Design a protein around this ligand. Sequence first.
Ligand SMILES: CCCCCCCCCCCCCCCCC[C@@H](O)O[C@H](CO[C@H](O)CCCCCCCCCCCCCCC)COP(=O)(O)OCC[N+](C)(C)C
Ligand SMILES: CCCCCCCC/C=C/CCCCCCCC(=O)OC[C@H](COP(=O)(O)OCCN)OC(=O)CCCCCCC/C=C/CCCCCCCC
Lengths: 83, 69
Amino acid sequence: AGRIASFLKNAWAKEPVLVASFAIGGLAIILPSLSPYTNYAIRINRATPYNYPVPLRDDGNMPDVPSHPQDPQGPSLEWLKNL
Amino acid sequence: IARTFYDGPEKNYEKTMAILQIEAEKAELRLKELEVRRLMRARGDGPWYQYPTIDKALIDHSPKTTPDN
Ligand SMILES: CCCCCCCCCCCCCCCCC[C@@H](O)O[C@H](CO[C@H](O)CCCCCCCCCCCCCCC)COP(=O)(O)OCC[N+](C)(C)C
Ligand SMILES: CCCCCCCC/C=C/CCCCCCCC(=O)OC[C@H](COP(=O)(O)OCCN)OC(=O)CCCCCCC/C=C/CCCCCCCC
């Protein structure tokens, strides 16, 4: 714990470029696993409608599927407007 | 000499019968296996000579952004 401090000081005094590069790379590696907004990025990617949504045939037993785009059923994007 | 070193003729006789039966059955089985191999390789309708085809489980049965696939 004491020799590595001297090593870090010497690296900062002799090769600052490599010190900055390693610090930036380590932050870029480890930070995304600790962020709560990564799942927000996943949801935003999933909410982009590239293709046409093909309707399902009504068999009379799907109360979770809306009968109209403005019906209360189906997914909501209200979380996206507050972001 | 006969009593001390040898057996009667019936032992050799019947052992020969058993040996002949085994060998004849083996020859018939060899010929049958050759014929079965020929038929199976010609028709491909048996367990042998089954060559792989594409797995149908790899197909995606989803709407494809176009109604006509
Ligand atoms: C008495 C004088 C007048 C007559 C003389 C006759 C001469 C005969 C003696 C010479 C020996 C003949 C050759 C031996 C060949 C026989 C080998 C074999 O086939 O026999 C076996 C029998 O084994 C015997 O032990 C054979 C022993 C003979 C070996 C010869 C050794 C002689 C070496 C000399 C040493 C002398 C001293 C040395 C000083 C250093 C069969 O085993 P088994 O699975 O049951 O068969 C089933 C049949 N049954 C049911 C009838 C029993
Ligand atoms: C608050 C603390 C900050 C903590 C930051 C993280 C750790 C920082 C220290 C880690 C290592 C720092 C640099 C290495 C130690 C000092 C440099 C050294 O070893 O000697 C210098 C010497 C170069 O000098 P010369 O060319 O030989 O000079 C010849 C003329 N005289 O270095 C070398 O020999 C090898 C250098 C290898 C460079 C690495 C290649 C690039 C990698 C960086 C890109 C991004 C990395 C991100 C991924 C890693 C994530 C952890």
